[PDB]
Amino acid sequence: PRRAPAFPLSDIKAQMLFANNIKAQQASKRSFKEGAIETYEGLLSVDPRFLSFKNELSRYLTDHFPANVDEYGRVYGNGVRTNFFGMRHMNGFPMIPATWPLASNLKKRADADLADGPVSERDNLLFRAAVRLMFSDLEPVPLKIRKGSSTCIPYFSNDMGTKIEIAERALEKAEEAGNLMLQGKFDDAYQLHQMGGAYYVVYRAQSTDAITLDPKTGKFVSKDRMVADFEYAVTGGEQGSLFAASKDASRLKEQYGIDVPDGFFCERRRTAMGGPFALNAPIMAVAQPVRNKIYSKYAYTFHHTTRLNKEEKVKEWSLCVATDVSDHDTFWPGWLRDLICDELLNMGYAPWWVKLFETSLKLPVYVGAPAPEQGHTLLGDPSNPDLEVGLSSGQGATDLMGTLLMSITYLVMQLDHTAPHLNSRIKDMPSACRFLDSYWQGHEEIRQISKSDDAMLGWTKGRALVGGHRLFEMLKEGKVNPSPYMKISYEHGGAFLGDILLYDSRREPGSAIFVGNINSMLNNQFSPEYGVQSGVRDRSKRKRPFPGLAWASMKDTYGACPIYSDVLEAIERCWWNAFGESYRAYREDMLKRDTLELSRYVASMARQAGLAELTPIDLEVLADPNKLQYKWTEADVSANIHEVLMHGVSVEKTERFLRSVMPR
């Protein structure tokens, strides 16, 4: 039922994706690569002392701090939700093979009994009202670009000057390119303005993944991660196979001469896609103003900063339901892309812009290297973008796409199962807009706090409260999916955007508190996704610019965890056993070095200014800017710190661009 066309790298269609420069040519050909990450300066993830430390610490913490999660997935007591074995991976060595990305998710959705469009007219009005509220009265802002980020297809440039030129040119030529696509001239739009082509598939590490200790055998078992072979990916699952990837690390001894201690595994690998920058720039120019609107006008539902900021909202609720979505990005529906596009056209958005946006969500994918002697294949034809991959991670508005889908999905779930008395308030578009505007501001008896696939659903006192409890019970029973749109369940150990909701004996939101997840501290400190990149001179371009700074924000971030002190003491004791050194002193030295190095990057910071004016968010972000892509936003970071990590195209160029996109 329609296989996607596939082209080898040798084919002209794949060759056209890579410009005549060394960087682009190397990206096309990049073979499967693996190796130990430089966890910290002069320390490898596979260092025998480091692995010995991880073995002792993971075993000790699991033993002394067993999970405290009730029958309803509510965290209590110690604030622990699982064992601590997730740290037991040979960081930098992936599971083999990684998945081939699914070219079509239509069969995947149908087989999971998920809808191929809005079920009812009410749902249709709500998805459309979400578009009207999110995209209406936007204000132009500079187009911000992450320093050291790639332009991907076709140039693969990491230079800021080149990136600024590409972005400015893209805003100037977006109209001409969009109009060519409207005429079906995709190859022309790509050849002239580099708008089209494909997403470039990079495989990123998920450094920690589930591991259990079998009491019967005393042997560790890693969570099986299902992967699709080429045949399965091109046929959308009609043909080929879905099988467990190999996380067995035994191979490292034979291949590399690395000693593999018992119960250490290869890392889970996730597909990540880099968009063609010329196509992304005009999308980003609209996406940022949308985020600014939703994080201001609809801050209740969408703007999440601190554990206390989240706590203030949740404490007012009579019931809090922490939801879980199965494989959000791969299940994301193409019918929603089409509904959004149709609604933007109805609002009066430039048709050429809507076409660029639509095309960004149908684009072919270039598969690099999922395993040795595999990959280097383009899936889909760039001459006619028609893929149904779900949500591409490198699309200019992925966060908004997931947020739009999920916010409405959860509201529908609350309406269907708890609040039929509110259905009368949604009769047409104006009434749907008025209702959603009120709901998103937290003004209804049914409420929510969400970001993409993470959410907490709330009920205050009223008619919907009883229904709220039945819905929670249906989730606990786990026999019926409460949504027609996505696979929803309850989170086992309810958390929101990294903060665990810690309940007491009462098991009520009013007496529950948000605390930092101590397991995330361990993930970040001992299992970073990337190495220190000590060879990259410009620290602002590194994936981990100032790792030492995280020590200064630790107490602020994790201090509220019941076992915070216990974990720090266990780390100190285990690090002494493994290295014969103080971990605290080691981190204090790294903090000093990185504080000194930071002043070189901040114009306002005198040669030895100190961390005085910096917030805990600023420190966490400087140590890990990936937190700025999933946890926080630009407005949460001090202006002088945002400038370290980002650079922008003038608001004058974006202001002119935005005027041409937006309705009259």
Ligand X SMILES: Nc1nc2c(ncn2[C@@H]2O[C@H](COP(=O)(O)OP(=O)(O)OP(=O)(O)O)[C@@H](O)[C@H]2O)c(=O)[nH]1
Residues in touch with ligand X (CB under 6 A): 206, 326-327, 453, 520, 523, 529, 626, 630
Q: Please name the residues in contact with 447: beta carbons below 8 A apart, sequence gap of 6 or more.
A: 300, 301, 313, 317, 439, 457, 458, 459, 460
C-alpha distances out from residue 17 to 25, 100, 145, Å: 10, 19, 22
Residue count at the site for Mg ion (CB under 5 A)? 3
Report in angstroms how near the CB of residue 324 gets to Mg ion at its nearest: 6
For residues 330 and 640, which CB has a smaller minimum distance to ligand X in the complex?
330
Tell me which of Mg ion, ligand X, none is bound by residue 388, counting a contact when its beta carbon lies within the kind-specific cut-off of 5 to 8 angstroms.
Answer: none
C-alpha to C-alpha distance for 467 and 413, rounded to whole angstroms: 11
C-alpha to C-alpha distance for 352 and 180, rounded to whole angstroms: 8
For residues 358 and 620, which CB has a smaller minimum distance to ligand X in the complex?
620
For residues 168 and 324, which CB has a smaller minimum distance to ligand X in the complex?
324
Residue 319: its H or E element: strand 319-325
Scanning 424-432, 453-461, 599-607, 653-661 for contacts with Mg ion by CB under 5 A, the matching segment is 453-461
Report in angstroms how near the CB of residue 270 gets to ligand X at its nearest: 7
- Pairing assessment for the beta strands 488-490 and 226-228 based on DSSP bridges: unpaired
Report in angstroms how near the CB of residue 129 gets to ligand X at its nearest: 26
564-579 helix and 583-598 helix, angle to the nearest 10 degrees: 100
Tell me which of Mg ion, ligand X, none is bound by residue 123, counting a contact when its beta carbon lies within the kind-specific cut-off of 5 to 8 angstroms.
Answer: none
Report in angstroms how near the CB of residue 209 gets to ligand X at its nearest: 8
For residues 493 and 528, which CB has a smaller minimum distance to Mg ion in the complex?
493
Scanning 163-171, 183-191, 448-456, 561-569 for contacts with Mg ion by CB under 5 A, the matching segment is 448-456
- The rounded radius of gyration (Å) of the Cα atoms in the chain is 25
For residues 81 and 269, which CB has a smaller minimum distance to Mg ion in the complex?
81
Tell me which of Mg ion, ligand X, none is bound by residue 206, counting a contact when its beta carbon lies within the kind-specific cut-off of 5 to 8 angstroms.
Answer: ligand X
Candidate residues 38, 388, 444, 491; the one interacting with Mg ion per rule CB under 5 A: 491
Tokens of 586: 């080691």
Tokens of 493: 């150990």
Query: Taking the CB of residue 110, how many other CB atoms lie within 10 A of it?
Result: 12
Tell me which of Mg ion, ligand X, none is bound by residue 431, counting a contact when its beta carbon lies within the kind-specific cut-off of 5 to 8 angstroms.
Answer: none
Residue 618 Rama label (left phi>0; alpha psi -120 to 50; beta): alpha
C-alpha to C-alpha distance for 526 and 141, rounded to whole angstroms: 38
- What are 8's strand-pairing partners? 377
Scanning 120-128, 424-432, 490-498, 561-569 for contacts with Mg ion by CB under 5 A, the matching segment is 490-498
Report in angstroms how near the CB of residue 217 gets to ligand X at its nearest: 23
Cβ atoms 490, 73 nearer than 8 A:
yes
Report in angstroms how near the CB of residue 461 gets to ligand X at its nearest: 32
C-alpha to C-alpha distance for 75 and 493, rounded to whole angstroms: 5
548 annotated among ligand-binding-site residues: no
C-alpha to C-alpha distance for 135 and 329, rounded to whole angstroms: 22
Candidate residues 454, 594, 624, 643; the one interacting with Mg ion per rule CB under 5 A: 454
For residues 327 and 572, which CB has a smaller minimum distance to ligand X in the complex?
327
Tell me which of Mg ion, ligand X, none is bound by residue 149, counting a contact when its beta carbon lies within the kind-specific cut-off of 5 to 8 angstroms.
Answer: none
- What are 265's strand-pairing partners? 89, 248
Burial class for 145, CB neighbours closer than 10 Å (0-12, 13-18, 19+): buried
Query: Taking the CB of residue 291, how many other CB atoms lie within 10 A of it?
Result: 21
494 annotated among ligand-binding-site residues: yes
For residues 69 and 495, which CB has a smaller minimum distance to Mg ion in the complex?
495
Question: Does 499 interact with Mg ion (rule: CB under 5 A)?
Answer: no
Tell me which of ligand X, Mg ion, none is bound by residue 326, counting a contact when its beta carbon lies within the kind-specific cut-off of 5 to 8 angstroms.
Answer: ligand X
Closest among 130, 109, 107 to 486, alpha carbons compared: 109
583 annotated among ligand-binding-site residues: no
Tell me which of ligand X, Mg ion, none is bound by residue 491, counting a contact when its beta carbon lies within the kind-specific cut-off of 5 to 8 angstroms.
Answer: Mg ion
DSSP 8-state class, residue 349 = -
Report in angstroms how near the CB of residue 491 gets to ligand X at its nearest: 9
For residues 194 and 407, which CB has a smaller minimum distance to ligand X in the complex?
407
Binding residues vs Mg ion (CB under 5 A): 454, 491, 495
